[PDB]
Amino acid sequence: MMEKLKEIEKVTKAIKEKILNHYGYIRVITHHDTDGLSSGGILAKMLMRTNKLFHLTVVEHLSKEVIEKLAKENEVNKPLFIFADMGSGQIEEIIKHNFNAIILDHHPPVIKDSFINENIIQLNPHIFGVDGSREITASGVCYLVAREFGYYDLSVLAIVGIIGDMQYNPLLGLNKFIVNEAREYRYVKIMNDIVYNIYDVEIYKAIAYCTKPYIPDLASEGKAFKFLKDIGIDPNKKQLDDTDKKKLLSAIIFKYPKIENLLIDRYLIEHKVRDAFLLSEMLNAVGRNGLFAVGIGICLEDDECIKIGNQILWEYKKNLINELKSVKLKKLNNIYYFEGKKGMIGIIASILVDDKPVIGYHIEGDIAKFSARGNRDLVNRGLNLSVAMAVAKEFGGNGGGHDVASGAVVSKDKVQEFLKRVDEIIGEQ
Amino acid sequence: MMEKLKEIEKVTKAIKEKILNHYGYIRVITHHDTDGLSSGGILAKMLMRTNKLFHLTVVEHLSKEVIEKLAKENEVNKPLFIFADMGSGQIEEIIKHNFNAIILDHHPPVIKDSFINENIIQLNPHIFGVDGSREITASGVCYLVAREFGYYDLSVLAIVGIIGDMQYNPLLGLNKFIVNEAREYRYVKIMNDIVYNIYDVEIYKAIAYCTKPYIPDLASEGKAFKFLKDIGIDPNKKQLDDTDKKKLLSAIIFKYPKIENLLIDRYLIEHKVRDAFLLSEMLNAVGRNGLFAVGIGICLEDDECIKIGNQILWEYKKNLINELKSVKLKKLNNIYYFEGKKGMIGIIASILVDDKPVIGYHIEGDIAKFSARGNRDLVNRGLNLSVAMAVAKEFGGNGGGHDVASGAVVSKDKVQEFLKRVDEIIGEQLR
């Protein structure tokens, strides 16, 4: 696996030189999810340390119209663009408008070349046989560029993105290399513990609003409080010691023997928000609320942005529980689907996935926007939701993403769009 | 003071609402000196906390050229411009191009209105009768906006700007208000102390590279080490205690009699660079090396930027000492003078002033350009540098400025003729 790095480090060195020798404006474009906001934080610290002022914007999707704006910015002062978690699928539109660009993306690539042309460098793990759905995230790609400057301290934000892209269990490939590098440089410590201990709130609240795992029967303050009381745990304590953890573990496993992932490898990172899993949920909640600049500030360890993050996190977690209780899951051939709120579609889908893919959507203006999630086991059986969702180009829209998670657009042909997607997932399976 | 803040509040409340209700791009444009970098750090934190992304640019001069640049960015996606430490002197070009703009500036205004039309707010202390050269800096003006959001923690960067812009002694007006508020909220502690204690390095190095004040006989590690060994102070320690300070001041007066210049009110701030005087010198060195983004990172408390900053500072200070030791200080009757390189005439002349005014020049085209410096005591005794340099519209050109700091331009052939005149008038001014 060391041989993979050496092929990668030839691109990350070319990227380093491209940044060092650029003295004009710099545009950084990222997504608003945990992994995208984490990417932006890594790039922000990296660019400031190399004396680069820059302009970051956060877009929910790198649509063609987003690309046509941004293209007008080239007319005078053509920036160096840095795309994170995007660009690889839109590479033809980027070549067409002739951006000077660095693409830092773990989505399946359309052109499988690192050095597109004179103007473009594409760092994509898939180009090197590393699986961007399981072995590195966009944050991790950004970190590989940062470590050429020796910014090993930025590995903690790579860890946050590992957690936010659901690549932390199991920990494979480059992700596991990054985690080990962080531990060796003393920026992270690893500690097995019960998931509820990461929140540092009263345990009945930590249980009530937990969604990994989500347990409907305990998903309320009253029912968690009584559950803890009935087994001899102070529900008002903020951390569970070893006696309490063992009582809680076996009581939950007795009445819910299906349950999984109650014990996790917690990552305590060198960051004002020391628990990486907490920080991941904070960035997510803040992104889903449109608080892009706050999220970047959290990455930069600003106290007030972190205060806002904590308050947004718990409003979100309460909203999410209310929404999970109210969701009407509908059944087709071999996908489930539902309708929900904008900043909630993707997480509810990944919460509820079990035997078959789940595809949520919310209605915004004149179009519907979809998030589907599979499993690793479903992808092992041949799923691939990026092929499946891109059939939006049959209903006048567009789509793509990862094999295990993808989104789509257009428009008011939803159920017309759904009965197609369920058909491809038949043949793929 | 509460009353003047009440009138200022009407402008800062308007600015807060203008930022909050803007959702397009935001451009921040600021200066490269300590006060300008501190302002960008204040604005950077304030914008992020209010959920605004922004694009920061650092300029040395808001010329008509750069204004016509930037205006090209207007034609597609018209951003909100926030100008810091500049803008008031150039308000006509900003009105011309119809920028959507917020001006946060302590320089003297061209148009003395806070509300200019529908699209431009200008917050300038002179509009409220506050002297922007003595009572508030650009970072103070930015802090006045940030406190509408309750961001009192940003007072620490305003203190840095107060230091950077030489407004800390005396501590007047709104600067005094800002420091007391910082202290009330426990963001700064104040401590009378000797200047060498701000650097937290071996005292023999802190003495060797000090330029406030510069003491030529101690301006080398060898001489400083020896001097400290002689008076019984461990030269490698990093803080002088009270016993050390008594001994060092007792002995140093024979080398530098104006020992009061060695004592300052230190500001210990809630920032990773805890000494505000040190943070100001660091920002200054970083700015002078073009490392503007690093400067913002330092305000943002990034560990690597701080590491670069500490390294650039000591490189800058060591090179400054070498520049001084290269100066060929020639004496007339009442003034010293010297020729030097164009980048640092004023800086070198201000450091060299001890007992007499110092005037430096560098010969450019066929021009000879001068910078003259005095001190508070010299001014109190009669020194008027603007009157003395003005005698250059008598050798073919121009000259003037402030009583303690002025400049002049004079045909390169009449350099000795101009110096004799200036030395004579200053001698008259001082008897």
Burial (Cβ within 10 Å: 0-12, 13-18, ≥19) of residue B283: buried
Instruction: Report which of A36, A55, A269, A3 is spatially closest to residue A152, judged by C-alpha positions.
Output: A269
Question: Looking at CA atoms only, how far is residue B424 from chain A in angstroms?
Answer: 49
Instruction: Report which of A66, A43, A69, A67 is spatially closest to residue A55, judged by C-alpha positions.
Output: A43
What technique was this entry resolved by? X-ray
B201 in Cβ contact with B221 (< 8 Å): no
Residues 6+ apart with CB under 8 A from A65: none
Residues of B with Cβ-Cβ distance to A292 under 8 angstroms: 51, 53
**Which candidate from A293, A301, A303 shows the least CB-CB separation from B53?**
A293
Dihedral of alpha carbons A276, A278, A282, A284, sign: positive
SS3 A300: coil
Breaks in chain A listed by the residue before each, with C–N > 2.5 Å: none
Domain that residue B84 falls in? 1-191
Least CA distance to A55: which residue of chain B?
B55
Q: What are the backbone dihedrals phi and psi of residue A23, each rounded to the nearest 5 degrees, phi first?
A: -115, 10
> DSSP code of A355?
S
Where residue B133 falls (left for φ over 0; alpha for ψ -120 to 50; beta otherwise) is alpha
B120 in Cβ contact with B95 (< 8 Å): yes
Instruction: Report which of B154, B41, B49 is spatially closest to residue A308, judged by C-alpha positions.
Output: B49
Amino acid at A298: I
Least CA distance to B44: which residue of chain A?
A297
Beta strands per DSSP E along B44-184: 55-58, 80-84, 100-104, 120-123
Integer CA distances (angstroms), B327 to B340, B346, B369, B389, in order? 7, 13, 16, 22
A360 in Cβ contact with A349 (< 8 Å): yes
Question: Looking at CA atoms only, how far is residue A25 from chain B in angstroms?
Answer: 9
B374 in Cβ contact with B357 (< 8 Å): yes
Interface residue ranges in chain A relative to chain B, Cβ cutoff 8 Å? 25, 45, 47-58, 69, 72-73, 75-77, 151, 153, 290-294, 296-297, 300-305, 308
Please report, to the nearest 10 degrees, the dihedral formed by the alpha carbons of residues B338, B339, B343, B344 taken in order: -10
**Which candidate from B73, B151, B297 shows the least CB-CB separation from A304?**
B151
CA–CA separation, A381 and B111 (whole Å): 72
Instruction: Report which of A28, A11, A267 is spatially closest to residue A147, judged by C-alpha positions.
Output: A11
Instruction: Report which of B98, B84, B79 is spatially closest to residue B27, judged by C-alpha positions.
Output: B79
Beta strands per DSSP E along B59-211: 80-84, 100-104, 120-123, 188-194
Residues of B with Cβ-Cβ distance to A147 under 8 angstroms: none
A188 in Cβ contact with A276 (< 8 Å): yes
Question: Looking at CA atoms only, how far is residue A296 from chain B in angstroms?
Answer: 8
Burial (Cβ within 10 Å: 0-12, 13-18, ≥19) of residue A1: exposed
**Which candidate from B25, B73, B294 shows the least CB-CB separation from A49?**
B294
Least CA distance to A309: which residue of chain B?
B49
The answer to whether the CB atoms of A45 and B302 lie below 8 A apart is yes
**Which candidate from A45, A51, A302 shows the least CB-CB separation from B45?**
A302
Least CA distance to B74: which residue of chain A?
A73
The answer to whether the CB atoms of B51 and A293 lie below 8 A apart is yes
Where residue A410 falls (left for φ over 0; alpha for ψ -120 to 50; beta otherwise) is left
Residues of B with Cβ-Cβ distance to A55 under 8 angstroms: 25, 53-55
Question: Looking at CA atoms only, how far is residue B305 from chain A in angstroms?
Answer: 5
Integer CA distances (angstroms), A259 to A8, A229, A357, B66, in order? 39, 21, 19, 63
**Which candidate from A51, A292, A300 shows the least CB-CB separation from B300?**
A300
The answer to whether the CB atoms of B53 and A56 lie below 8 A apart is yes
Question: Looking at CA atoms only, how far is residue A285 from chain B in angstroms?
Answer: 14
**Which candidate from B54, B294, B300 shows the least CB-CB separation from A51?**
B294
Q: In Å, how far from its chain's centre is CA A83? A: 15
Neighbour tally for B126: CB within 10 Å? 17
Task: Tokens for A44, please give them.
Answer: 């922000």
Q: What is the CATH number of the domain that holds B50?
A: 3.90.1640.30
DSSP string computed for A41-110:
HHHHHHHHHTT---EEEE-S---HHHHHHHHGGGSSS-PEEEEES-SSTTHHHHHHHT-EEEEE--SPPS
Mutate to test the interface with B, among A49, A58, A154 (most CBs of B within 10 A): A49
Task: Tokens for B111, please give them.
Answer: 């148009």
Least CA distance to A78: which residue of chain B?
B73
The answer to whether the CB atoms of A294 and B49 lie below 8 A apart is yes
The answer to whether the CB atoms of B302 and A53 lie below 8 A apart is no
Residue listed under structure tokens 């050109």: B397
Integer CA distances (angstroms), B121 to A13, A120, A216, B74, B104, in order? 46, 41, 53, 18, 9
Instruction: Report which of B47, B64, B65 is spatially closest to residue B56, judged by C-alpha positions.
Output: B47
SS3 B335: coil
The answer to whether the CB atoms of B291 and A151 lie below 8 A apart is no
The answer to whether the CB atoms of B47 and A293 lie below 8 A apart is yes
The answer to whether the CB atoms of B53 and A52 lie below 8 A apart is no
Q: What are the backbone dihedrals phi and psi of residue A102, each rounded to the nearest 5 degrees, phi first?
A: -120, 125
Mutate to test the interface with B, among A42, A55, A156, A312 (most CBs of B within 10 A): A55
Least CA distance to A304: which residue of chain B?
B49
Least CA distance to A56: which residue of chain B?
B53
SS3 B362: strand
Integer CA distances (angstroms), A145 to A19, A42, B396, in order? 10, 10, 59
The answer to whether the CB atoms of B49 and A73 lie below 8 A apart is no
Helix, strand, coil tally for chain A in percent (to 5): 50, 15, 35
Instruction: Report which of B308, B319, B387, B368 is spatially closest to residue B347, judged by C-alpha positions.
Output: B319
CA–CA separation, B303 and B313 (whole Å): 15
Please give the interface size between A and B, counted as residue pairs whose CB atoms are below 8 Å apart: 86
Q: What is the CATH number of the domain that holds B345?
A: 3.10.310.30
Interface residue ranges in chain B relative to chain A, Cβ cutoff 8 Å? 25, 45, 47-58, 72-73, 76-77, 151, 153, 290-294, 296-297, 300-305, 308
The answer to whether the CB atoms of B303 and A153 lie below 8 A apart is yes
The answer to whether the CB atoms of A304 and B45 lie below 8 A apart is yes
Mutate to test the interface with B, among A25, A42, A51, A270 (most CBs of B within 10 A): A51
Q: In Å, how far from its chain's centre is CA A327? A: 23
> DSSP code of B169?
S
Beta strands per DSSP E along A90-247: 100-104, 120-123, 188-194
Question: Looking at CA atoms only, how far is residue A53 from chain B in angstroms?
Answer: 5
The answer to whether the CB atoms of A48 and B294 lie below 8 A apart is yes
Sheet holding B398-401, edge to edge: B330-331, B336-339, B358-362, B369-373, B405-409, B398-401
Task: Tokens for A43, please give them.
Answer: 């790039």
b/e burial code for range A365-400 (CB count within 10 A of at least 16 → b): eebbbbbbbbbeebbeeebbbbbbbbbbeebebbbb
CA–CA separation, B55 and B70 (whole Å): 12
SS3 A26: strand
A188-A190-A193 Cα angle (round to 5): 140
A155-A160-A163 Cα angle (round to 5): 125
Residues of A with Cβ-Cβ distance to B19 under 8 angstroms: none
Q: Can the peptide bond before residue A213 be classed as cis, meaning omega within 30 degrees of 0? A: yes
B1-B7-B12 Cα angle (round to 5): 110
SS3 A258: coil
Question: Looking at CA atoms only, how far is residue A200 from chain B in angstroms?
Answer: 24
Question: Looking at CA atoms only, how far is residue A106 from chain B in angstroms?
Answer: 25
Residues of B with Cβ-Cβ distance to A290 under 8 angstroms: 51
CA–CA separation, B409 and B341 (whole Å): 15
Task: Tokens for A146, please give them.
Answer: 């940062």
Least CA distance to B290: which residue of chain A?
A51
Amino acid at B81: F
The answer to whether the CB atoms of A55 and B293 lie below 8 A apart is no
Q: What are the backbone dihedrals phi and psi of residue B426, each rounded to the nearest 5 degrees, phi first?
A: -60, -40
**Which candidate from A51, A72, A294 shows the least CB-CB separation from B293?**
A51
Q: What are the backbone dihedrals phi and psi of residue B423, each rounded to the nearest 5 degrees, phi first?
A: -65, -30
Least CA distance to A305: which residue of chain B?
B49
